[PDB]
Amino acid sequence: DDDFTAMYKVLDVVKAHKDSWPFLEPVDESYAPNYYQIIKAPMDISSMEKKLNGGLYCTKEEFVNDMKTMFRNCRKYNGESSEYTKMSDNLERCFHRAMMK
């Protein structure tokens, strides 16, 4: 199957994972004060899904880079001990495995 379908299947696997729910929509400062002063390259799953449907992932590498940015932002903002960082780590390992199939 083609790259678009391949990438979309990976999104579906990531979205279906139990720990995906914090990452589904753009970060809201209601629960994350000063987020956009701290994180200058924000990313979330809905935004990736919009890019994918809009034809903006010209290569799989660009999709990977956005996914990895979303995880890096979570760790940077929430810190190493956050429950959310643990979720990010779990989701990132799931993502790596999905990406290789």
Side-chain angles (χ1 to χ4, degrees), residues 2-36 38-79 81-100:
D2 57 55
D3 288 345
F4 172 79
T5 304
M7 289 183 284
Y8 228 133
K9 285 184 190 166
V10 172
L11 274 186
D12 289 337
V13 168
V14 172
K15 285 183 59 85
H17 191 283
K18 65 192 266 313
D19 292 324
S20 71
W21 61 266
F23 306 103
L24 287 175
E25 315 248 285
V27 176
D28 193 338
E29 297 199 346
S30 69
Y31 59 81
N34 296 326
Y35 193 76
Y36 293 98
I38 296 182
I39 299 303
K40 301 303 197 189
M43 188 53 63
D44 67 275
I45 292 162
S46 73
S47 300
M48 295 187 58
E49 199 169 334
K50 204 153 295 135
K51 289 174 68 156
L52 181 57
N53 280 309
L56 299 187
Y57 293 127
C58 299
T59 60
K60 284 205 255 209
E61 182 167 15
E62 293 172 11
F63 176 76
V64 176
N65 292 327
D66 274 356
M67 186 74 73
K68 316 270 292 127
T69 301
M70 178 175 80
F71 306 134
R72 190 161 68 244
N73 293 336
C74 176
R75 304 195 288 277
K76 172 75 147 43
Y77 181 71
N78 298 109
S81 73
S82 177
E83 60 183 301
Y84 295 109
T85 298
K86 298 227 161 209
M87 298 169 82
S88 182
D89 287 349
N90 295 344
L91 204 59
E92 182 163 37
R93 289 190 281 281
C94 167
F95 165 71
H96 292 152
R97 174 166 185 285
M99 207 55 217
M100 291 188 277

